[PDB]
Specification:
The structure is cut from a larger assembly and holds chains A, B and C. By secondary structure, chain A is of the alpha/beta class. Chain A contains 24 helices and 36 strands. Chain A has a domain of about 100 residues: Barwin-like endoglucanases (Beta Barrel). In chain A, the strands form nine sheets. Chain A has a seven-stranded mixed sheet, sandwiched between helices. A six-stranded mixed sheet of chain A has the order 31-35-32-34-33-36. In chain A, helix 10 packs across helix 17 and helix 12 crosses helix 13. Chain A is globular and about 90 Å long. Chain B has two domains: about 130 residues, 2-Layer Sandwich (Beta Polymerase, domain 2); about 350 residues, Cytochrome-c3 Hydrogenase, chain B (Orthogonal Bundle). A five-stranded mixed sheet of chain B has the order 1-2-5-4-3. Chain C is of the alpha/beta class. Chain C has a single domain, classed as Rossmann fold (3-Layer(aba) Sandwich). In chain C, helix 1 packs antiparallel against helix 5 and helix 2 packs across helix 5. The chains are: A alpha/beta, B alpha+beta, C alpha/beta. Chains in contact: A-B, A-C, B-C. The interface between A and C is small, with 5 and 4 residues. Bound molecules: 2-decyl-5,6-dimethoxy-3-methylcyclohexa-2,5-diene-1,4-dione, iron/sulfur cluster (4 copies), FE2/S2 (inorganic) cluster and calcium ion. One iron/sulfur cluster binds next to helix 7 and helix 12 of chain A. The PDB classes it as proton transport. The entry lists the keywords Complex I, NADH, Quinone, proton transport. Complex I from E. coli, DDM/LMNG-purified, with DQ, Open state. Chain A: NADH-quinone oxidoreductase.
Chain lengths: ~900, ~575, ~200
Amino acid sequence: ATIHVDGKEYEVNGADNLLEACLSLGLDIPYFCWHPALGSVGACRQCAVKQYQNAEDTRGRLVMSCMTPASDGTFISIDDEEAKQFRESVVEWLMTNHPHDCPVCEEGGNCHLQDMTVMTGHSFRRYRFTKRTHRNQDLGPFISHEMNRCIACYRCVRYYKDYAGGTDLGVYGAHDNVYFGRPEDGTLESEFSGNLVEICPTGVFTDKTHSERYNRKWDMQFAPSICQQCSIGCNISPGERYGELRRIENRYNGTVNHYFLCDRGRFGYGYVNLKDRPRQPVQRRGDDFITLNAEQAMQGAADILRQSKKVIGIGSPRASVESNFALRELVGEENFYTGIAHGEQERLQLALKVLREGGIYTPALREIESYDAVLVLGEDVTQTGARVALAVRQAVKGKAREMAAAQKVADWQIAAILNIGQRAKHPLFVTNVDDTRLDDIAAWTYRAPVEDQARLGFAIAHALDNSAPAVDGIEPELQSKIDVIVQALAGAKKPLIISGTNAGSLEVIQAAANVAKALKGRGADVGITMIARSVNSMGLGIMGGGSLEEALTELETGRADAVVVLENDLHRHASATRVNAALAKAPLVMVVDHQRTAIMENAHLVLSAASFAESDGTVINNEGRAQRFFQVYDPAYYDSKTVMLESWRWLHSLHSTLLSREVDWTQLDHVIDAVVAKIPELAGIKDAAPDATFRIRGQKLAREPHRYSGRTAMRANISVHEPRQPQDIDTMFTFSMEGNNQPTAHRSQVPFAWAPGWNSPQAWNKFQDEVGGKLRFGDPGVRLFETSENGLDYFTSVPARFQPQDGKWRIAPYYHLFGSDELSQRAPVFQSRMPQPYIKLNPADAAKLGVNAGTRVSFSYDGNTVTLPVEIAEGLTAGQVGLPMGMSGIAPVLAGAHLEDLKEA
Amino acid sequence: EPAWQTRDHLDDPVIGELRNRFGPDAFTVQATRTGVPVVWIKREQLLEVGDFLKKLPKPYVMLFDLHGMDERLRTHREGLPAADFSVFYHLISIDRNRDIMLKVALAENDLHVPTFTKLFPNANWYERETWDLFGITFDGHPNLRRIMMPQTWKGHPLRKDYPARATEFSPFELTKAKQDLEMEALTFKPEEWGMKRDFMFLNLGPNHPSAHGAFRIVLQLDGEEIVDCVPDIGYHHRGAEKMGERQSWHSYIPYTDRIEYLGGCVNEMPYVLAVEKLAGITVPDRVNVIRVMLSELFRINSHLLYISTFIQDVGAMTPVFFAFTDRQKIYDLVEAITGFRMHPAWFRIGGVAHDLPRGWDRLLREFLDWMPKRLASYEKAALQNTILKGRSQGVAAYGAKEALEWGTTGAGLRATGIDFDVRKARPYSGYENFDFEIPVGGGVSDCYTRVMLKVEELRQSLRILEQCLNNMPEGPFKADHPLTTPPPKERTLQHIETLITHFLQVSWGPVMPANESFQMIEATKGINSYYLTSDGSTMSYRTRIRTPSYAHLQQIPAAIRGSLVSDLIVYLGSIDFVMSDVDR
Amino acid sequence: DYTLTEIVTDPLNVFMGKLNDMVNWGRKNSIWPYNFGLSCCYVEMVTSFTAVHDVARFGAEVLRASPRQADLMVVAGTCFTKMAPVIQRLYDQMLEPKWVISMGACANSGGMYDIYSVVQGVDKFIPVDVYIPGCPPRPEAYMQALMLLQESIGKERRPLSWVVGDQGVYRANMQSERERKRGERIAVTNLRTPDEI
Ligand SMILES: CCCCCCCCCCC1=C(C)C(=O)C(OC)=C(OC)C1=O
Ligand code: SF4
Ligand code: SF4
Ligand code: SF4
Ligand code: SF4
Ligand code: FES
Ligand SMILES: [Ca+2]
């Protein structure tokens, strides 16, 4: 299409509306109610331009550019005097009731309303009357509510309801008393409620966790990092100030997590700021804890390692690729053990084999929203991979999108799309041990044990393709529902099969692979998604090694006298008693970690590693994409006695001191090149980010904004002399403003979005080639593996039905978004949000034991009698007992595990 | 059409002459808010374009400015030739009362331009500074050596990839530079300094017991006569332009104060006028009158300092005490108005920081009654002394040709008989509404002639203050523009729109739309100009400051050659320079 | 509470104490500053030297062009990288006893010029006795710094002769002026409104 803006010709896409087309060209139109992800509704009337019928037209007409299609040969004007005066009048009308709140408002300096008030040039107030006020609600521990600052742009309700699928937020009231919130005080129920702080263009919804230790946006030090709280790998911008992590903002990745995080990623960063973290290396001498510097800790550790006869290394899926590789190099490939259980490692390896050998394309998180039918097998995605659940909701609304497109309704006119697609939606079939949070939009929900879910998947694969193995013992109504699933999936142009390793069953993953193969054989454009557990689970699976049980037997039999545990608490992957016995038997335990774990009581040496905020590295997400996270701040800048290094730096210097009796604090690119040379399956991680020599016209990339303040006074209480600026030899970023963050810079790693006149999160529009699309010059991250030409075979190992045996109790996993991730549990703000641990029981089983709802029962596993109060779960299958995974004492290795001595306390 | 409107200046006769001489495709005309025709010339045609402008019927006789620009990070270069770097040449035709900027584009690898020293002899120091701060080579330059940084300096500080902040201090570098200073006199080679050839060699500096700064002069002597002399400058280099690339538009005003520290608001004036050109701000008349008031008060302060310093350099010691009492009276008024003495930082984008305090007219009337009897006493006690006249008259004289070819402005140029004052030729800040004369010399610029012209300028500034006191407008002290930084304080404190504008203007900075502006003013020591490039951001993309003391110090060897050393001291005392103005 | 050049107590017969007091009195009542002009702070210094302020009343007007005859080095201006070896050489050329006053934010810390060509404070390479904030400090602030230096000089112990006695220099650890004036500064309630004169 061709448009003429202010007499200048432009070539745009005709399917877009005028506002997004003009913002993609760099033109500045003020706007409030439109969002690139939510569509156009034409409420705020801020985006007004003047449209003319032809070139020889002088009068024109004011139109909303967000609601005007960018048709071919469209003549408009933004800088028309009438349009400018109307946009100024809209800003003024918004400003009549706005509170005098900017100094004491957390959105100041990050406010879209401030930016558009300045952009319209409106700075004189001629309104002399009273301003309306509102009471505020309590929205829980995460979101702070300030209703006075609202401009009634309806972004919150549209996002939270039409996009996120939440139910408890809404718009109440009338003419100019419109209220946006919950009907009563209470916590926002959605797992994606945290994106309201970026969706809201004003200070109504604010980050309460940030509002505790508040600082303005110009005062933050930012870095482009990857969220470490599950395997999705959403791009984040951690921002720090005064040596502590202050905020997690969304970082735009048009291929992964474009505008939206989940609440675990956004608010579960509080473990970084804990005061019990290791900040110096500590050596045990009898009962004494001697604090060492880097050099003497490395010398003593390498000497004791040299006197040892066999050193084993226990990695972790929390650690980066470089740190796991450095441990593998230090202890040797044959002595390296992945720090996960044998069943967990088997499920992880099977998921990786399906992803990179099954011949079926695995979509990115953004690409999930374009699929026509979704089958989720055994994976509670809302609690384990939440952004996948959000993308599944978008893919479900794709049917309403297609129905509206059949009636020649444009894709940005969201109200008409929702009107045409009333309740018609794409087929969604979820299977779990109980009800999921996707049940409100699911076409069918199957509450069954993991064997029965696997048998359902194998039956679906057999009915789609008769070459697949059959299932014997299917009930006729279950067969009818299976047939419903089969005709829904076979009629889909782009079916999607989602599973993962959190189900605790190998057969569920095998059944999902069988369904995907059966759909691939029919010619469908099938995609497969596997949800892992931790941030670098796929990286640890690609690296390979032994299981944690093998390392425990190596420690117990005395074949290994030295163990180096990297970023692993060892209690989430094995029993605590056996781990404690093996670590007490081992004469040398060296724990390289950044969190105070329980295994440092018996550890001979504790190396104060860096977390993601204080380190660089690479992580492989659930779809096999290598992503580089960068260090946010130097921990030794404010506390000069802090020796907190990267884990790969610790292990590489330990290897160098073990070999040549000399420390070597290496560079990140050297470890990256070592990974690429030694492990060819991880050769793609070289291209995740450019090396430390990367420059933009000769200068580095800035971590902090141009107006970063207090540089001669933040450390003046320690010493009036300004310290040396921390040098960054590992990466292309600098710990200063002396760098580049231009939106037109040829790069893909963007620490934060800021353009002049756009201080809000809306500056990501300036950082994209087209708004709502990809990052300009490509999104960061590279897929490690391509789709194989030939797939796997059908898995003939069809499990039997779940048999409830007396005495035994099958543990059904119950994951929680706030409580299943270890570091997220360590965050103090999650302690109020996380629920009290309830053991879930069937009504029939609770009647059999005679226990009611709320009474405490005690059960023993691995000789550990623990007590929990009972919650009645009707959707659970009899013979199963539900356990909340990741919680206090309930390790996630209990999925699929049997249970003994379930008795009332 | 306001004065700040973006003009292309295609109706200038110089554009038609250039088109008729070199053809229509030989150059590109850029539309700016600088007020001058900006013409991008090809590099190979630069010397003939400069010669053609020098041979015009009313020629461009003065090279006003010559400096570089790093355009690698400039995003809004629409209609501009492709350039990793550029070099601009600002030329002034006094007879036409016009000026033209010529810009030469340069690639990143091919950073060399033909030298301009043959057409204009004052291009030498400008090309040395452009090489020093940008790495731009000038082919045919006699001694292309560093002029601000020491010779053992790596990198070019005004480039975009150069880190602006201070490096970590090291005693090793201080000890090495002390050893270099100690062995400098032992291993002095008069070939790297641009000199040639009983010829004594002496160093005047680097420390100097005077009030104009501390700088070093290498003197070649035949007995008492000065055969050759080059100045070693850059000892007072504060990196003010690089700070222009690091501050916001509003928070850079205190840095503009300290360019020449005897001027204050006189130094603030061209910067805020250029920023108001970038912002599209037409300030009201009371703002113009207040800014003229403060500029003339600081002009009287600076001229009293200059006359006292000259008299003390001659040898009389008492008038400096008396004129410092007069400076105390001026400082009392300035302290009452702005709150500070010599770096007020009171001018704002769109106006001034506060209104005039109630009672300022009493202090102005007291100073206006105090000044003239004291000035007459200074004249009759020192300026009419025949010993002072013998020490001053005939010392370092030059005509209009030497003043034009060296870029000499201010009292020296007008002492050569050229009636070129910025306040009359190219009026700014409502200077047309004041009745004042421009004193001129007979055609020869002595030390004594320059000093008496500064005395007459002081009297004319007293006349301006009298007219301003008798006719004071009532109105706003800030413009009503949305880009007036900061907004008026009471509206900020009780209106949310004004609070939002204030919040974003003081924190992130005011957003100047992408343009280029230029303001030239008649400062206390000559012509002071600000050339501002905005890339659409809250910071300046380029802040070029042309100061007159640089040009006067470059004119120093061409006027004192063949004279004595006491004549050199008197000439230094009568130039009206400060080393901060030289190095900035 | 002293400093020996180590934190020691006061080393101070009663005739030696009187002689030391007489020497300190003569030293603090006759302070000869060195004539050294760096930047605008020097202009305010020499303004204090003139008739309207009359720094001669304290006996500190003999402004020497030779560092040998000067007792006080007033670093009044920016410590540029090219000027820093000159400052160090001129400080080294002075004779015992010698005192240093940093005048202005540039000489204190670098001030507003945290830039590539400025040394961030003159205490990076010479020891400073009295700091003056301000940009520029007004002339009476320089006078007040002179009285602070006089009070510091009057309570320091130096050897009377280079052949007899302890040759170490004992400088008193004065109470900070911030802590001394905190009593009267916090008690301020109302100031004159800025709209008046
Ligand atoms: C070896 C030659 C010695 C000559 C006399 C030097 C001592 C008297 C200095 C007088 C003086 C001068 C010249 C002077 O210029 C000055 O102003 C800064 C003073 O302070 C008020 C002075 O005291
Ligand atoms: S929401 Fe924006 S405009 Fe409103 S008080 Fe906060 S910062 Fe100011
Ligand atoms: S609360 Fe925020 S997002 Fe919701 S309508 Fe008001 S301004 Fe818009
Ligand atoms: S979905 Fe996973 S990776 Fe994304 S923000 Fe949530 S916890 Fe982090
Ligand atoms: S502190 Fe201020 S007044 Fe003093 S030298 Fe520095 S810029 Fe000049
Ligand atoms: S953005 Fe178009 S009316 Fe709101
Ligand atoms: Ca690092």
